[PDB]
Structure 1
Amino acid sequence: MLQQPTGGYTTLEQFAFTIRNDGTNATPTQFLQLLSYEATENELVKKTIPTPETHLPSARNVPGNVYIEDAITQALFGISAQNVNAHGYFSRLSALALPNTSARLGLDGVIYNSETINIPFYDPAAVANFAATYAKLGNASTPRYRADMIDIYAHVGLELAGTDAERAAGVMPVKRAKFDSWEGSLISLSRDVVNWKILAFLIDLCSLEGEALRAFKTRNRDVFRMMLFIMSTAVAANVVNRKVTKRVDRVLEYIGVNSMRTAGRTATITYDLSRHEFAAKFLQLTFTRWNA
């Protein structure tokens, strides 16, 4: 069992989040610097996120080792992820929510019903806090619990492209993102992100409290923003290169506005409706935790 550092698991060099920038390793923060925005006549306004349902999916036992980290990261970032709303994984997740469960979350991101001494794992109290919220991702498909797939993206825009004054104001112009880019910059970015060990991020988001938690929110804002960016490319209505001088600028119109596009396209990973339900529910839970 890995002890959780007062700053959270994300402090560990084992859990560093990084992305290739035209192939060279770089922190997400030094990628987000490349991004620049052009405002338009429409205006995003972030009305409050409805509070998530208390109802966790039932903790039915399932054969095998659920690969929950890969499940979530693929549902959010992977190319054409499938079976994202299949119920078994999140049922085991809710089993992790229990006060004295036998189940364990490996640093690998797998869940093992065995105590499994050979494989290092997160502190069970922390994953209890984390599963207690993220098991709700299993509610993403059920009609009673579907998250607003549209309005939540306003928050995404604000947390990504929003200037500090707009982030205070809660209202920002809809923006058109652009950056100097390479051949498959968005796909390669989604590859670089889908490999992220996000459960460190989420477990830290749920387990930490007070000053350590707020310091986590400042220390990791760029990470959260990169996941937000990959989702934004997934939901952007339109994405196109613009040839400025010899440089090629990728241009995503528009940030913060989910087009509900589902057909695949070359430029970016694409959400089927199941991925929209999932991503929207994830954003509900994550933005709720992020704003507290």
Structure 2
Amino acid sequence: MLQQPTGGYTTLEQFAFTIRNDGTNATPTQFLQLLSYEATENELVKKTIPTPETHLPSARNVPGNVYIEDAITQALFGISAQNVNAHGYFSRLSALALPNTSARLGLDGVIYNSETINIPFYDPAAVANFAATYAKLGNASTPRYRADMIDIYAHVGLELAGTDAERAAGVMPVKRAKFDSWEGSLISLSRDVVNWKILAFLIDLCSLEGEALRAFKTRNRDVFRMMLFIMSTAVAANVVNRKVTKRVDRVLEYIGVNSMRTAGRTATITYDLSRHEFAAKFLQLTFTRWNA
């Protein structure tokens, strides 16, 4: 078992989140610096997010060790994932939700049914906190419980594109994000995010409380925004490149507006309908935790 520090698991160098960029391992924030925004005529106004359902889906008798992390990260930023609701192994997270369960969420991102030798794992209490919300990802598909896949993206915009003033106001112009860019940049970014150990970020977002939690929210804001950026590229209506004096600037339009588009394209990872409901549920939960 890994003891959780005074800060989150994210304080450990073992869980550093760093997208590749300009021949080095950039922290997500210094990539977010590269982003710039062309405001348009439309306005995003964030409605209050509905409270996530009390129900935690049954973790049906699965003998094996589910690889939960890989599933979440590929339903979120995968270059080929689809029918993420079909297997429905996200419900397995619920097995960790019980007090004193023998299940352990390993750093590998696997859910072992039993504590096992030479496999380090998160403190079961904190994991019970994290499961207590994110097990609800298991009912991202069920008709009674699906998230809005349209409204929540306005929040994404605010947490990504928003200035401190637009953020405090709760209403920002729809923006067209852009950055000077290399070939295949969005695919490289998303694959560099699929590798992230996001369960660290999620477990700390659920377990930490008080001032120690708040310092997390600032320290890891840019990480959240990077995931948000990959999602927003997944739903952007179009991702043009602009030539400009032998420098190319990638431009995605628009941040904060789900286009619902499901046809594939070389430029960015694509959501099947199932991944739309998944990411929308994930966002409902993750923002519901993020604002408190």
**Structure-1-length-normalised TM-score:** 0.98
Name the CA shift for 1:198/1:136 in 2 (closer, same or farther; >3 Å). Answer: same
CA shift, 1:114, in A, is: 1.7
Match of 2:144 in 1: 144
CA shift, 1:89, in A, is: 2.1
> Contact 2:104/2:121 (CA < 8 Å) preserved in 1?
yes
CA shift, 1:250, in A, is: 0.1
> Contact 2:82/2:271 (CA < 8 Å) preserved in 1?
no
> Contact 1:235/1:257 (CA < 8 Å) preserved in 2?
yes
> Contact 2:83/2:272 (CA < 8 Å) preserved in 1?
no
Match of 1:278 in 2: 278
CA shift, 1:88, in A, is: 4.5
5+ long unaligned stretches in structure 1: none
Is 8-17 or 89-98 further displaced after alignment?
89-98
2:144 aligned counterpart, secondary structure? helix
> What CA deviation, in whole Å up to 9, does each residue of 1:227-268 have, x standing for no partner?
000000000001010001110000001000000000000100
Name the CA shift for 1:43/1:88 in 2 (closer, same or farther; >3 Å). Answer: closer
Provide the rounded CA distance (Å) in 2 between the counterparts of 1:201 and 1:272: 25
CA shift, 1:212, in A, is: 0.6
Name the CA shift for 1:62/1:88 in 2 (closer, same or farther; >3 Å). Answer: farther
Is 22-31 or 71-80 further displaced after alignment?
22-31
> What CA deviation, in whole Å up to 9, does each residue of 1:81-105 have, x standing for no partner?
1331145522321010001111001
- Name the count of aligned residue pairs: 292
> Contact 1:174/1:256 (CA < 8 Å) preserved in 2?
yes
> Contact 1:38/1:177 (CA < 8 Å) preserved in 2?
yes
Provide the rounded CA distance (Å) in 1 between the counterparts of 2:289 and 2:87: 23
> Contact 2:91/2:136 (CA < 8 Å) preserved in 1?
no
> Contact 2:91/2:137 (CA < 8 Å) preserved in 1?
no
Percentage of matched positions with identical amino acids: 100
RMSD: 0.9
> Contact 1:77/1:190 (CA < 8 Å) preserved in 2?
yes
Provide the rounded CA distance (Å) in 2 between the counterparts of 1:225 and 1:63: 36
Moved over 3 A (4+): none
Provide the rounded CA distance (Å) in 1 between the counterparts of 2:117 and 2:92: 19
> Contact 2:63/2:113 (CA < 8 Å) preserved in 1?
no
> What CA deviation, in whole Å up to 9, does each residue of 1:147-177 have, x standing for no partner?
0000000000000000000000000000001
1:144 aligned counterpart, secondary structure? coil
Match of 2:161 in 1: 161
Name the CA shift for 1:262/1:45 in 2 (closer, same or farther; >3 Å). Answer: same
Is 14-23 or 183-192 further displaced after alignment?
14-23
Is 22-31 or 210-219 further displaced after alignment?
22-31
Match of 2:63 in 1: 63
CA shift, 1:80, in A, is: 2.1
Provide the rounded CA distance (Å) in 2 between the counterparts of 1:41 and 1:259: 17
1:63 aligned counterpart, secondary structure? coil
Match of 1:44 in 2: 44
Provide the rounded CA distance (Å) in 1 between the counterparts of 2:64 and 2:216: 33
Provide the rounded CA distance (Å) in 1 between the counterparts of 2:186 and 2:285: 25
> Contact 2:83/2:275 (CA < 8 Å) preserved in 1?
no
> What CA deviation, in whole Å up to 9, does each residue of 1:23-44 have, x standing for no partner?
4210000000000001000000
> Contact 1:87/1:138 (CA < 8 Å) preserved in 2?
no
5+ long unaligned stretches in structure 2: none
Provide the rounded CA distance (Å) in 2 between the counterparts of 1:196 and 1:224: 12
Is 142-151 or 82-91 further displaced after alignment?
82-91
> What CA deviation, in whole Å up to 9, does each residue of 1:53-97 have, x standing for no partner?
000001322021100000100000011213311455223210100
> What CA deviation, in whole Å up to 9, does each residue of 1:198-217 have, x standing for no partner?
00000000000000100000
Is 109-118 or 86-95 further displaced after alignment?
86-95
Match of 1:180 in 2: 180
> Contact 1:22/1:181 (CA < 8 Å) preserved in 2?
no
1:154 aligned counterpart, secondary structure? helix
Is 77-86 or 211-220 further displaced after alignment?
77-86
Provide the rounded CA distance (Å) in 1 between the counterparts of 2:91 and 2:229: 29
Match of 2:103 in 1: 103
